[PDB]
Amino acid sequence: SQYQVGPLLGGFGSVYSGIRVSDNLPVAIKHVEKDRISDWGELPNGTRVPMEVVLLKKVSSGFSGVIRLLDWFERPDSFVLILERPEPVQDLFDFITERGALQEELARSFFWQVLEAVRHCHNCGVLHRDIKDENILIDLNRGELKLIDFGSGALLKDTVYTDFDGTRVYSPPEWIRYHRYHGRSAAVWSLGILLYDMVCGDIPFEHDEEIIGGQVFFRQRVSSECQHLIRWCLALRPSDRPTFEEIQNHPWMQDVLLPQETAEIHLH
């Protein structure tokens, strides 16, 4: 009643376009089917809600890197989430499709923004688990990236995970063959898939054998520095992968553009 629903918006995802009638504010309205909810969380109030609402609540401290949850409702058979909607926006998946391999400069800006966003999640005790181009929105005006869809997320823990319902082609080798992984190292792996994707125009692996293989072939001209970082993130042994500090101290990561500069140079 506070919001006017509009058209569907991303396959198998039940997200609509909306406007808050109070301030005429663009929003996104996600519906989650109670009978489909695999991971259930609990609020401070003892209210049983989907993990996603818990994770969104914890990360919504006004750091623009993550899409903030503006509100949620319970319904007989579903939950409804109101999320901020930037305008104009295009998801990074569609963006790469339309533009192909991105110049390193743009890839650098984007990647950095994604890292900052993922670090913030971790600092807030949240693990995304589904980092991919599809799950990143671009504010075309501001040049700001925003991480979305925490439906596969979990509470961050320093111990081993034995569940996963993220994107397989982004999942790490250890998951594929052992059914176990550590959050941060898994994240770094997926960030390596993501970076390949930006600079090559698509993900490196399609099949479990390729994943387990850890053979990274470059289809496009990519600089040594960037290849090094990608190979590093996609190290087969989780322990061999860089930390976020190591990623952000990598030579390839030096001299990032501000989101503003990125907009002017790359999106206008």
């Binding site: 589904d130 599809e134 596969s152 994107t167 397989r168």
Partner: peptide, 7 residues
Amino acid sequence: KRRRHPS
């Protein structure tokens, strides 16, 4: 061929 993948 480049495509989306499910969760």
